[PDB]
Design an enzyme around this catalytic site. Sequence first.
Site, PDB file in Angstrom:
ATOM      1  N   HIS A  82       0.803  -1.218   0.000  1.00 12.60           N
ATOM      2  CA  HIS A  82       0.000   0.000   0.000  1.00 12.60           C
ATOM      3  C   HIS A  82       0.836   1.268   0.000  1.00 12.60           C
ATOM      4  CE1 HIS A  82       0.223  -0.345   4.572  1.00 12.60           C
ATOM      5  NE2 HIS A  82       0.432   0.950   4.427  1.00 12.60           N
TER       6      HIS A  82
ATOM      7  N   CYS B  73       4.221   1.130   9.754  1.00 11.00           N
ATOM      8  CA  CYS B  73       3.861   0.047   8.840  1.00 11.00           C
ATOM      9  C   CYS B  73       5.152  -0.431   8.132  1.00 11.00           C
ATOM     10  CB  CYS B  73       2.735   0.530   7.906  1.00 11.00           C
ATOM     11  SG  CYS B  73       1.244   0.583   8.954  1.00 11.00           S
TER      12      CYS B  73
ATOM     13  N   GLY C  87       3.455   5.651  10.741  1.00  7.75           N
ATOM     14  CA  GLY C  87       4.804   5.477  10.255  1.00  7.75           C
ATOM     15  C   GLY C  87       5.413   4.131  10.575  1.00  7.75           C
TER      16      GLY C  87
END
Lengths: 302, 302
Positions: free
Chosen positions: A41, A145, A143
């Site tokens: 993503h 991920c 932040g």
Amino acid sequence: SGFRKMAFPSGKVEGCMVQVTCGTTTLNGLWLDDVVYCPRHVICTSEDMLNPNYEDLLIRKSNHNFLVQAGNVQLRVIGHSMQNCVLKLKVDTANPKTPKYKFVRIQPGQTFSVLACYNGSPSGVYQCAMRPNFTIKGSFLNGSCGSVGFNIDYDCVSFCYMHHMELPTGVHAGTDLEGNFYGPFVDRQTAQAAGTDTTITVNVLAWLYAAVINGDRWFLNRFTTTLNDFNLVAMKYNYEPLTQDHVDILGPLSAQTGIAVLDMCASLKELLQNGMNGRTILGSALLEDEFTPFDVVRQCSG
Amino acid sequence: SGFRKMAFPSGKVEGCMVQVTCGTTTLNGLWLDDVVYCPRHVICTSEDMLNPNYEDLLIRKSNHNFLVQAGNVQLRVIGHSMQNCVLKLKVDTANPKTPKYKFVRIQPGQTFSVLACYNGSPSGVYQCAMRPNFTIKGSFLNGSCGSVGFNIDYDCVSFCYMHHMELPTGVHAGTDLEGNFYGPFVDRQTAQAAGTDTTITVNVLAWLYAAVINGDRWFLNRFTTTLNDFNLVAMKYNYEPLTQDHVDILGPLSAQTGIAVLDMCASLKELLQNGMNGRTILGSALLEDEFTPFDVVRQCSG
Ligand SMILES: CNC(=O)C[C@H](Cc1ccc(F)cc1)NC(=O)[C@@H](Cc1ccc(Cl)cc1Cl)NC(=O)[C@H](N)Cc1ccccc1C#N
Ligand SMILES: CNC(=O)C[C@H](Cc1ccc(F)cc1)NC(=O)[C@@H](Cc1ccc(Cl)cc1Cl)NC(=O)[C@H](N)Cc1ccccc1C#N
Ligand SMILES: [Cl-]
Ligand SMILES: [Cl-]
Ligand SMILES: [Cl-]
Ligand SMILES: [Cl-]
Ligand code: NA
Ligand code: NA
């Protein structure tokens, strides 16, 4: 003595964390040999995230759209591909700090260490258990991920988790390192709910054995129940049923303490039915289910 | 979101851990530049440990009595000296992995990460608080002595603890990296008792703020007490008195949540007087005192 939630030393993983930027989205990636792995993503805009078609979005990207930084050294992307929910960015440099590693998918009820990272920089390390409903109860801010979970066995790092999202309930969902989600989740910015959770019975018993090894004995009793009669109590309190293989896995701890597994199950039955009456076990006033039998043995050798 | 006991990433410290052997005693040392630091009791035999005279014992040693191994690479000892309870072994090789570091002594009520090591090999990492009575409640087995505790601030490692012994109560005692013990302990194999411990009030309040930030609000109330009237309740429950500087240190969290410190103290007073009535705070059924205000801010930024 003592018993603590203990993570694996994180050094081998720290050397692999990088920052991946695509457009205005920045998250963490994992740099092993000449490949960087990160959540796919990263290629989405704020608008794309509601209902992304990732095949379309990736075909519209090129290598120069991906900024990879390992510290302050920029890595040149020479190829990109997608495997399930992970993006694989080929880079022109093999990571000289690549440990011996494997990609393994873990089972619910097993534990692993999480290296929480922001902008490619590791910030902290802690233990997590995979819940029966395939979520983890982590500690993650925006932040985070792309942060990874792992176990270490004789200097081989077994990577088992990449962080993808926080659910509305504040628990966390991600994939294995082949990009396959744990549980019934998808990588899009929609409200998704986990299934009902349950307590990991074999882990609670392992932790009771840890407590005995460390000198907490107040909850022991002379009683012994049967596997079937305990599992009737387990169902009433939303505990997973105990199997004979669980008894077998608990054999070593049972032998070290001299307390038969079904004897300890009688203690657990009483703890569930009556509470603790104001006492504690290994510094907790609740029954703890995030230590595996392996976690106990590794920490309670002596 | 989420709130976990989180250690610092341990990689910078892992690169410094070595094994030090003297006679039949093996423990861990810390290799920084061309010096290895370790507990001086490595020079004692089983008989010496009851009542060692370390000045005599060291004068009877020479460099070749000390075996230092960094992995499988043996380090040649070219000088030995003693500073308080730490031995300093000069070696012929500067550690190429020496981080930027400082030796700092911490205060009771502050936290640090422990890298548990055995035979020079790191095995796990976890957070510890220094108790008001200068012990730590760690997880250590035989062979763990010489393991170090540290904090990390902008890639500078502040070493604050070297592990020396487990007390008969199962808690742990050690020194700063200048070899000065925390608390009223000495490095000899005799039964020593810590002073009476107390609960770290400012840390409990910090953790209540963490819980509010993470959505646990059931313990809040519309009341506000005075500093003096709260401290009367603190003394009754063996809590440290709250000072105005503690209120100031808690200011940032109080501002982020909109709950005045003395308002949260009213909640703590009620929690102490009435218990939780079966409810939990951040997954605990007890009031947690091993998170500093800094620990909360570092993990609850968002
Ligand atoms: C109180 N809870 C929250 O506000 C977290 C919200 C909950 C929420 C979930 C769905 C929804 F429709 C509305 C709200 N979740 C996020 O905002 C997600 C959005 C998202 C992005 C990419 C992908 Cl593939 C899936 C999703 Cl769902 N963003 C992340 O996870 C960030 N990368 C990391 C992150 C950012 C901020 C806070 C915690 C974490 C962490 N960890
Ligand atoms: C149930 N508790 C125990 O059995 C631990 C005992 C308690 C006890 C303490 C005093 C005493 F007279 C009798 C018993 N303590 C140890 O045996 C110490 C002995 C010792 C050695 C060197 C120095 Cl300078 C001081 C001391 Cl006091 N050995 C260590 O700490 C080891 N290096 C590490 C260690 C070994 C085994 C278990 C845990 C740990 C750890 N961590
Ligand atoms: Cl813990
Ligand atoms: Cl593999
Ligand atoms: Cl925790
Ligand atoms: Cl210094
Ligand atoms: Na493959
Ligand atoms: Na000095």
